[PDB]
Amino acid sequence: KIPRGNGPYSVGCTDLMFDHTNKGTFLRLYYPSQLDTLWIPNKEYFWGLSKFLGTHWLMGNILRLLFGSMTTPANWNSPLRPGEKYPLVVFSHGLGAFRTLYSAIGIDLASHGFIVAAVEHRDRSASATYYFKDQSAAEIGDKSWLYLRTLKQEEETHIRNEQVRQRAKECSQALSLILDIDHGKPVKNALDLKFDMEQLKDSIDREKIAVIGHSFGGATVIQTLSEDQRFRCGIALDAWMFPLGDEVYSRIPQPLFFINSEYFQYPANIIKMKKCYSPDKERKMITIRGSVHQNFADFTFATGKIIGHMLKLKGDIDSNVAIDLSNKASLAFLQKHLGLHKDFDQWDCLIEGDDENLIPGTNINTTNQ
Ligand SMILES: CC(=O)Nc1ccc(S(=O)(=O)Nc2ccc(Oc3ccc4ccccc4c3)c(C#N)c2)cc1
């Protein structure tokens, strides 16, 4: 029940791991293709989700039975659509998520002509992820799993900041890998999938790179922008600003778009967003009325209305309407600041919060002094 992309391009999906260690890059790629992709491809992700939610062994298996064969609307290993160079989005997941849980966003961007690299972070913020201990292990698919670390309260400030720095490093590394493939670097996918990465040679518009992320990933957008001038702009979906150091807020040259849910936000968090503002920098913010934190992630589509509200997976707003607004506003912002030659400027009003379901900026107030 994950919505198909609303753009005119058909969408393909594949996975890339290189190198095979936990210091290598692991991403899911959504791309314009020339609808059978497994949404959550391994049992360990469900076990990891169960740990994240604070439940035991049995819950893991329950989630697996429920969602284990569910797909997402992208053609698995379909050939890349040839003939044109695509803008690139690197996408960062929230705490307790992993690379496949933002396919509603990834697939919609791909359907509008983007290549999207959804990274899987190895900072121990993912519910689960894996790597291979050596080439031999990779060759027989012998995975080594890393589960989410839970932190003591005294540890939080320090570790979350180290994690967001590791996350920014992984977004940059993912960018570097894709740009190297674009220029013909041979890569041996540690996964042995029927998609040839040589397809990506000369397929990237190297001047049109953006970073997008949700929650922890929203902080990662800001840290990545600050560290990596190759990214041209950023969109932070309901950013959780806590992991960032005080020094970073004034060190974001690139245009930045905050798209917030209504019920997630709170003054301490909003204050840090406003610290990113400067008269000489491009900043936009909107809030989606009635939305909750999880409106940006795929489990907002995975259940019925009533159980969804109980689990805080759904807000007062409809999940399709909310992701539509976010995606369309994102496309307009990307067109404006990547210099895209598309018709996304039809949604320019959404950047300004000009819609019944949008608030310009935020309803939360904070000191300006
Ligand atoms: C209390 C708390 O920290 N909360 C929290 C913090 C961060 C996030 S996140 O950034 O969206 N990261 C994130 C983490 C896990 C995710 O899968 C879920 C989420 C909730 C579930 C509830 C019932 C059954 C299955 C579920 C599976 C999804 C998704 N989509 C996204 C989500 C919730």
Side-chain angles (χ1 to χ4, degrees), residues 2-3 5-33 36-50 52-55 59-64 66-74 76-83 86-134 136-138 140-151 155-168 170-187 189-193 195-197 199-245 247-281 283-304 306-309 311 313-315 317-342 344-355 357-367:
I2 298 168
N6 286 97
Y9 295 85
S10 61
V11 177
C13 181
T14 194
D15 283 324
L16 176 55
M17 186 184 302
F18 183 82
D19 61 26
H20 64 271
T21 73
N22 70 337
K23 306 307 170 180
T25 288
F26 192 11
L27 58 86
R28 167 156 292 194
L29 201 76
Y30 310 94
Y31 51 88
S33 69
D36 48 355
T37 302
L38 252 204
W39 181 38
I40 301 169
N42 304 93
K43 62 192 181 304
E44 290 83 0
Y45 289 116
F46 294 112
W47 298 348
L49 279 169
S50 185
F52 171 69
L53 300 171
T55 53
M59 177 60 52
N61 302 89
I62 296 166
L63 294 175
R64 187 186 178 192
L66 289 171
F67 304 110
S69 45
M70 186 170 153
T71 55
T72 185
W76 182 246
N77 288 337
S78 184
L80 176 66
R81 170 181 184 270
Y86 301 111
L88 175 66
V89 165
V90 175
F91 186 96
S92 177
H93 62 75
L95 179 71
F98 41 95
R99 79 189 181 284
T100 72
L101 294 186
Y102 294 87
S103 66
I105 299 176
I107 288 166
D108 194 71
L109 287 164
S111 73
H112 282 99
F114 287 83
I115 290 175
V116 180
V119 295
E120 190 150 297
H121 292 294
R122 268 61 168 281
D123 67 332
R124 305 302 293 282
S125 68
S127 266
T129 183
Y130 63 98
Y131 70 101
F132 299 96
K133 287 196 167 171
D134 57 35
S136 293
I140 60 172
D142 186 21
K143 302 174 185 71
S144 302
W145 288 89
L146 270 21
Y147 294 97
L148 171 95
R149 278 212 75 218
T150 71
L151 309 180
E155 292 184 305
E156 280 273 341
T157 296
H158 173 73
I159 293 191
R160 295 302 183 205
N161 182 254
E162 292 301 318
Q163 285 178 316
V164 79
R165 291 177 190 275
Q166 174 164 354
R167 282 161 150 264
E170 288 169 338
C171 292
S172 296
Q173 183 176 297
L175 177 56
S176 287
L177 176 65
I178 293 156
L179 292 176
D180 291 346
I181 288 168
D182 176 70
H183 274 358
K185 177 183 175 167
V187 304
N189 195 347
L191 321 173
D192 183 63
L193 300 177
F195 181 99
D196 169 36
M197 295 294 162
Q199 280 179 86
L200 301 171
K201 179 173 173 72
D202 296 311
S203 78
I204 304 285
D205 193 329
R206 307 175 64 95
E207 289 189 313
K208 297 183 175 53
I209 316 298
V211 62
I212 301 172
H214 172 240
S215 196
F216 211 148
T220 302
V221 164
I222 285 161
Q223 187 74 34
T224 300
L225 286 175
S226 187
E227 294 183 7
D228 195 338
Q229 194 60 35
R230 295 174 301 178
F231 289 100
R232 214 181 165 173
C233 69
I235 301 170
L237 308 169
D238 235 13
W240 174 52
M241 304 288 291
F242 179 82
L244 298 168
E247 63 286 358
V248 79
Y249 302 120
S250 74
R251 286 171 176 165
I252 308 159
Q254 305 99 324
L256 175 58
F257 192 10
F258 295 98
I259 300 176
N260 299 341
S261 73
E262 185 161 16
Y263 289 103
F264 175 67
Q265 290 297 333
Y266 51 99
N269 204 59
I270 294 294
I271 290 172
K272 298 176 172 180
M273 299 183 173
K274 299 205 344 199
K275 284 187 174 177
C276 300
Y277 277 58
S278 188
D280 63 314
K281 290 172 181 192
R283 306 287 182 253
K284 307 303 288 198
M285 181 186 302
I286 59 174
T287 301
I288 303 175
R289 289 189 192 276
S291 60
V292 296
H293 197 48
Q294 293 254 27
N295 269 123
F296 297 94
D298 288 345
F299 269 93
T300 200
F301 298 109
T303 80
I306 292 93
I307 192 79
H309 284 73
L311 297 176
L313 290 176
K314 294 179 167 301
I317 194 183
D318 168 88
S319 291
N320 259 281
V321 166
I323 207 57
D324 281 5
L325 284 164
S326 184
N327 287 344
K328 286 174 184 181
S330 294
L331 294 163
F333 189 81
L334 295 164
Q335 164 154 333
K336 193 172 298 306
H337 300 291
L338 296 186
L340 301 182
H341 306 77
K342 299 285 192 188
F344 305 153
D345 65 312
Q346 75 181 281
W347 303 305
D348 267 7
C349 53
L350 298 185
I351 302 173
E352 313 302 332
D354 190 15
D355 183 274
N357 291 315
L358 293 183
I359 307 162
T362 179
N363 35 8
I364 294 164
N365 291 2
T366 69
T367 182

